[PDB]
Amino acid sequence: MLDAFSRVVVNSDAKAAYVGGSDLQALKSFIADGNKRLDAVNSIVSNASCMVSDAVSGMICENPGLISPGGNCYTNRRMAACLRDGEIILRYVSYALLAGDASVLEDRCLNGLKETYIALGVPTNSSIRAVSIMKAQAVAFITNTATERKMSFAAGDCTSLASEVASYFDRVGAAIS
Amino acid sequence: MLDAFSRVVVNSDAKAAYVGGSDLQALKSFIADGNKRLDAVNSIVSNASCMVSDAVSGMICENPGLISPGGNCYTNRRMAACLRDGEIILRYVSYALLAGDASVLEDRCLNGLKETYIALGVPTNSSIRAVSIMKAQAVAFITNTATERKMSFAAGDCTSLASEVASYFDRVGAAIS
Amino acid sequence: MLDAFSRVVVNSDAKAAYVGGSDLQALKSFIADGNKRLDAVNSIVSNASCMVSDAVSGMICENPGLISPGGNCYTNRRMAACLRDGEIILRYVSYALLAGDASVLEDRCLNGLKETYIALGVPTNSSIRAVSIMKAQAVAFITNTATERKMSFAAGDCTSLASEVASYFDRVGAAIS
Amino acid sequence: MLDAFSRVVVNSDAKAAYVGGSDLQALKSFIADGNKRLDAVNSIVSNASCMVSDAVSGMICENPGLISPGGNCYTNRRMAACLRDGEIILRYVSYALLAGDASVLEDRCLNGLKETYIALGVPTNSSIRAVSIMKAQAVAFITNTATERKMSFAAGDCTSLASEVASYFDRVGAAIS
Amino acid sequence: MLDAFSRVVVNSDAKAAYVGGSDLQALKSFIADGNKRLDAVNSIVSNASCMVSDAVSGMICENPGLISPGGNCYTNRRMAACLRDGEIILRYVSYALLAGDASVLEDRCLNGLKETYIALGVPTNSSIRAVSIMKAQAVAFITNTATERKMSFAAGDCTSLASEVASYFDRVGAAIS
Amino acid sequence: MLDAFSRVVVNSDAKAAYVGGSDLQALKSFIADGNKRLDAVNSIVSNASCMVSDAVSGMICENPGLISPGGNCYTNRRMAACLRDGEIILRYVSYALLAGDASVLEDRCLNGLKETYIALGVPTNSSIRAVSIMKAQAVAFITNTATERKMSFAAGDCTSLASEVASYFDRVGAAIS
Amino acid sequence: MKSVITTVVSAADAAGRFPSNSDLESIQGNIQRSAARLEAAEKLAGNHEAVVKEAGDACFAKYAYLKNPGEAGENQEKINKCYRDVDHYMRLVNYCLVVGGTGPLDEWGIAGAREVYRTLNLPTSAYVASIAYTRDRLCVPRDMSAQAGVEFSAYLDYLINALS
Amino acid sequence: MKSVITTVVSAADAAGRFPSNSDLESIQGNIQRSAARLEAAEKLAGNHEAVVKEAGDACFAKYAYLKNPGEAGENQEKINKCYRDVDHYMRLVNYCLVVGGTGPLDEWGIAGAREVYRTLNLPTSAYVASIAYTRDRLCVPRDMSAQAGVEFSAYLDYLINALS
Amino acid sequence: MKSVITTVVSAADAAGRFPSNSDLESIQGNIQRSAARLEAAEKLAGNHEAVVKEAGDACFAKYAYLKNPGEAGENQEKINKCYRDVDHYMRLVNYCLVVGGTGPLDEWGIAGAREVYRTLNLPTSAYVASIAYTRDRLCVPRDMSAQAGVEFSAYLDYLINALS
Amino acid sequence: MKSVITTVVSAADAAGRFPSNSDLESIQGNIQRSAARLEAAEKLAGNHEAVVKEAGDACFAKYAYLKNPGEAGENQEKINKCYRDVDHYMRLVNYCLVVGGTGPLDEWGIAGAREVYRTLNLPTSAYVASIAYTRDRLCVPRDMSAQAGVEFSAYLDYLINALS
Amino acid sequence: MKSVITTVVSAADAAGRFPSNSDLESIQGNIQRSAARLEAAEKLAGNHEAVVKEAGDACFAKYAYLKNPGEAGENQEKINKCYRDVDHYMRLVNYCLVVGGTGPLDEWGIAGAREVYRTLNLPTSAYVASIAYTRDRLCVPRDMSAQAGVEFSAYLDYLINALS
Amino acid sequence: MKSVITTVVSAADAAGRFPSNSDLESIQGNIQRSAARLEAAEKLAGNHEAVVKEAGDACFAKYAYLKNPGEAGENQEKINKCYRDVDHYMRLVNYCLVVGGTGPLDEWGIAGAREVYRTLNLPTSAYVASIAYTRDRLCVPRDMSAQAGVEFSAYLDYLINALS
């Protein structure tokens, strides 16, 4: 896996190029905005059980067929596997936000997930709805605008961090669509 | 794997339906005919070495090319693998008759057998002839009409049990055709 | 794996035929030329490090893009894997020459190598050039006509042994082309 | 593992003796009283959760130092291990009562347990108290003399089964003392 | 494992000494008499089945309690294990005779056998009788003095090879006593 | 494994005590002096190759019989194993210095080493000399008093870190004596 | 799906064995015990709405707190899901009585339940209250024969122990 | 030792399970089938000497070449071990009928038998002749009841199939 | 024990590596964040008795049904163990703040907790009520600095998430 | 296919090694011993019909019982398969003598033979009778040189031991 | 690619864990130490041609033998490859200083280097001479700050130890 | 110890086989090739002191930079260990020629050699110079017969290839 810094190094090595002052402004800004990124990750991990519970329950209340017989969340075994998948996806999205790079998500989570869901009969459309609800929750927590819980932060702009996490959630739906 | 009873349960669960008196008549009859099914299974298992030996020898005397060079029963190693496959198939057919359901046969024997035989160059047509001879033997033993051995039973109708075992043998040829 | 002798046996068994005097002249000649074959194999194994080093360096000096970024020998890790593959190929070619049969090469080296190189992005064309240089070296050593090293032999014709090893090298390029 | 029947066969095999009428009056009685034995095992397995939690809770309330720092039930990790061991021991005792022989308990549970507890620092004296509480519970359930639950039985006497289950519990403390 | 040659090298390495003419007269003789050694090993391996069955049968006919209940060859499972051990021991002795050194027998067969037989309750005294019968057989075959079979040899003397194979058999009883 | 912080927590947990101001003056000082500790570990890991080769070379030049036949550094295989062990021990000592606690060294390196060296015939007395030479090297590097290299530090005193690394080296000989 | 038949077939398969006498003898127990458990299954199939109503009512009677905002039963739709769940379990008990084993409870009711109830904040005590109330409410011989009642009770106790 | 009880207990133990309904139901099969197999065991126990003589007699009647030099019944001592072996097998059939399972045959008579008979050059057809003669000699209900003969015959066929 | 130091050392040891720059750089993170978490630990150490009383009080205020017969706080001894447990968890939060990692909670409070609370029929919502009340009671900078409260809150949320 | 060459190549491959001096030295044994075994192979190739006739005749001479109804040689087609099998084995002995190893017997004759002869009720003693008669019938120097005879005998003894 | 971030993420992943406080605290070390190593990276990026020229010159100054026929530097193209290699290594040192870990050296410079230098007969002493000369040539504070110099030195020493 | 005999025995042991014809045939290769390799061993044994002096001499003649400060032959004690090592290798070549296999070189000289020479900064080209000089110094039949020189040269090349 790569992080924001080794991503720059991989791009430079492709041109046999040293990383110099020209190339470092984004990375110096990444460092200067580092406390905000640690806060963003804390806001998600601190609410992760409620996010998954609420996102999967949401997917179901909107499409109650999922819990009918022959539905894919019918039985405790299936529902537990689905909640497990919501937590795994959220885990790898949180790694991507900590690292400032999607590689851990793409390589260890999304690689071969479409093929797995196809084989298993896991509805990729319902999955994407669960992920879209977790995107909505994640942006609310990073920006301290969740309706049912606020956390403690020095006031500042986290727009970029909210945009980035939204982009990671969007890759999941891109990979399994 | 399923049995005659959990097959009914799987069909009912598909309609979120309780199993009640309406649905139980076949299963109460399965129970009432239970001693005959135990006898049927005993008649096959008690003759299983002779069935396999005779069925594979039969496939060969009808198609003596199988034991020519480049034939698939040429060499002791190949002949032993073929007799082994006859015994395995007969084993899973006997499980299906004991259970009153084909699932153990389909899931643990026939799943991926066509693909295996294709890869190995095992002639699926000659295999089907071996299986058809074991079907002929099995029906003869269940009905106590084998020419070379009779066994001990209280007199009664075992037509249904003979029809059922014939249906299991027929699935093998269906799966690898 | 087969050798020159079990190759004859496999061909005879296909016709359910004994190996007799008619069939043995090639094999009696194989035996009579045996010391030369042991010398041929010694001439290759005794120079194997220099052959691989020189063959891979050769592939590179002719196509210096291989060691540019995005080239397949760029980095020490890649270069080491390539030199490793040159040594493996040369090893299995030396087994084939010792045995007087290509089966160990085809079965344990070339089986699935094209598919592996495709998956890995290993350039099959550059690989074939490395192998063609090792063919050129091998023929020079078997015939004691290498420009930079001579070895000790009783004088005699090794044309057939040079032709045979060239045929083994040619199978590699055939398998991955 | 042995059951009441194969125990007799092992004893007879030591004398190269056939099991005859002379020998079978214990086993025919074992069969005659078999419904009582099924009821006894049902009465244990139906209350097994409550038995283990009550027994471990009782061992602790008599010896509260077990849950102080340096105590072997201190931390949730240790309390969970202890509850697991209570359940494992009760499960093996229930198998011994179902089979009418101690071999499964001795072979699979008690062989190596003393050496293990000594290695881990599991107090054997406290373990033996937990087991003695489960013995009193099981004797109460088998004889339908529990204060907090009654279950449903045809009128008769299960004192022999209660004495037998007590003997299996007693083997645990004999092993680990 | 060591052979007669590497044994000499190990002894010379302990003195940091080169193996010179002084040292080589045993090994040149070992080579000179090599055809006799190949004949000796052939005479054993050609009769190995008969040797093991006759030796184990002889151990039993002298000590019939071995096949009574509680006896260590009672049951087909135990008789098969004992016959297997007779074959294993003879196979390792034959390797020692082929190599002109006991190391393969000591390292791979005898190291841990005493402790194993004691653990299993394999009677070492009866094992040593089986081995002594195989020693007498092998000495007879090597010297072409078996009563029930003659084999084909150029005229000469193999008393040294017979003494050597006896010394390897004797190491078995030395290990397990 | 424990570090200086979790060591304090383990000691406090034994008393069921909270870690308060009273308890934290060692840990606040550990943090205050943390830059010195990072420099100390850097000074070791930057010279680790030279330290191991010099220490093993020193053990040998004082006791040259170690490289004579029957000597435990005789052969390249044994000298390589010994150099590997020197590196392993130094790596575990460096972890102990980074963590401010001996547990990783005791748990992962020293637990079982004496019994292992006795089994292998590794001379513990010579091992302890190698370790004492690495102790003198590390104390010199930490205090920037090596004769052959100076490294770069802010002016101050690292005698406490030098005493601490010496105590970790001393635990090695305490374990294997 | 665990039953008398699948247990002995699975064991024969793991050893590469044809069915033999102990397998047939096991399945004869099937024949002997079936009347009692099919009696219990038909009674439960015939009257499950009434049984489920009593069981859910018993849950909410014991734990009025469930109806409080934030809690598992805070609104009417959540309360209706609770009675649905109790019906799901009683339907799996009907299946166990037909199969003659715990397979249907194990596969479709118990596997994953701990994760689900933990994650959705559904108190296991409420489910135990509904099952326990049903076991205790059973009336022999009013509702069924003694041995039908033992079969019914065994599966309710199995589920309680699985939740505990 | 393979029996109804050891099969269901070993299955429960593999899965870390208490005994459950399908296990009790299997053992109820014991109670039901035991009368028939115990009758077979008692009849065999009471008359094994005469059964074994007929069995060994049939073997040597069918295969007179056994009594030739270098063959398996070439002296009286080897013939006596042949009858002893037939006795051994009938004693294991007795044990199978008591345990209600093949375990005694499996462990004490079949395991290793191919290796032993191959190495000692004892023809398996000779053993099959003795066992098949006994199977076919059986006269119901002269010698035992119908279902005692079904139990007895099932172990004899089990042994024949194991040797074939 | 999971901490900055044990994470990087265990990673180095898995790969047979000496400590390198990224490992030293991680531990520099300790030096930077330690002031905030040690302030939280000291404040908790100095006032845990009052924190624990409020926490247990909030649990029984929210869930009065606990004090009923057969329930988890049905006598004074069981109520006292409830406060003791809340104290246990606050002492592990103190330890987490000193180590700079979840290790103390992980090893001593969370591992096995689901099994224990399930078997002893202790409702996890009762523990979550006590922990969440403490989290939400926190008043900055009255009780500690902003970043001490961030550290304290992070372990309390870690524990809530572990129970959910 | 086991020979001098495939043994040393297989060993070199398992260790990732180029051929080295012990490998070449092994194969020199190939050169030395080939004349003797190719002599034996050519003699057997030249006269196999006559050898096979004598071997099958010896089988049926020793075991007249084979011709009895039920037995392995009960009719003329079964008797002809027996002589065919003996020819198959003599053809594999010819192959072993050409290859200079047991590979052809091992792969094409011995592997699975125990299962086949057990399942089709073909007595192993009959096959041993045919092979043993051929080994004993060998006449040195009438049929071949002494060392051709040792090579021929070794493969016949190898097969007998494989069947025993 | 080993860095502060990938180490703690990889460890969280192996345990199936969300990021937690020790992970965030590690990455704060990233923030603290970055100025020093990015200073060293920018200086090396700005002046690598001059640094590489001095390092290669130092190699050939110490080992004139390299220029002899047969040797690694026998002609001008081989000498130019040597300076290219030193530039490759200095570029990987620049990358390590940007990433804040040994990942780029480990993956792209060290892995396989022993095999490559052994096989192409490139003496490891020459590479160490170039790296050591660069480490020793560093001039604080002329070239960079003290702590930039520690970061630069650490990666040069890491590479020397990797080659030794 | 790798030799003809240990190769074929280890192969037989892997497969649970007695020695068979291809194994005896391999060892006949020993008898045939032994004269040539034992002549090489005896010549080396009788003249190793003079061979070793020429070899070490050629190394220091080719690589005079070894005698410089901080390099591998910087004092007389280090030069003496260099000749001792060349002697060690020639004694292992002697052993290879006696065993008829690479085993002595493999186990006692090559295994670990890359690690040792890398850690002690001993350039492998220095060892190769000594070995190649000896290989190329060989004069046939002045120093030994043609096929003794083939055996000697083969081990020297084996060692050079192992260091390259």
Residue numbers in the entry:
A (entry chain BBB), B (entry chain BBB), C (entry chain BBB), D (entry chain DDD), E (entry chain DDD), F (entry chain DDD): 1 to 177
G (entry chain AAA), H (entry chain CCC), I (entry chain CCC), J (entry chain AAA), K (entry chain AAA), L (entry chain CCC): 1 to 164
The authors write:
To the best of our knowledge, this is the first time that PE was extracted and purified with such a purity grade by using only a single purification step. To determine the protein identity and purity, PE was crystallized, and its X-ray structure was determined at 1.60 Å resolution. The X-ray structure is constituted by 5990 atoms, including five phycoerythrobilin (PEB) chromophores for each αβ dimer, one methylated Asn in position β72 for each β subunit, two sulfate ions, and 324 water molecules and refines to R factor/Rfree values of 0.222/0.256. The structure confirms the formation of the (αβ)3 hexamer but does not allow to identify the exact location of the γ subunit. The α subunit contains 164 residues, the β subunit 177 residues. Each αβ dimer has five PEBs in position α82, α139, β61, β82, and β158. The first PEB, which adopts two alternate conformations in our structure, is covalently attached to the side chain of Cys82 of the α subunit by ring A. The second PEB is bound to Cys139 of the same subunit. The other three PEBs are found in the β subunit. They are bound to the side chains of Cys61, Cys82, and Cys158. The UV–vis absorption spectrum showed a peculiar shoulder at 498 nm, ascribed to the phycourobilin chromophore of the γ subunit.
Porphyridium cruentum is a red marine microalga, reservoir of potentially high-added value molecules, such as carotenoids, sulfated exopolysaccharides (EPSs), B-phycoerythrin (PE), and lipids. Carotenoids are well-known antioxidants, also able to counteract many disorders, from type 2 diabetes, to degenerative diseases or cancer. PE, the main protein found inP. cruentum, has a good market value for different reasons: (i) in biomedical and molecular applications for its natural fluorescence; (ii) as a natural red-colored protein to be used as a dye for food and cosmetics, and (iii) in the pharmaceutical industry thanks to its antioxidant activity. The analyses revealed two major bands, whose molecular weights corresponded to α and β subunits (17 kDa) and γ subunit (30 kDa) of PE, in each lane.
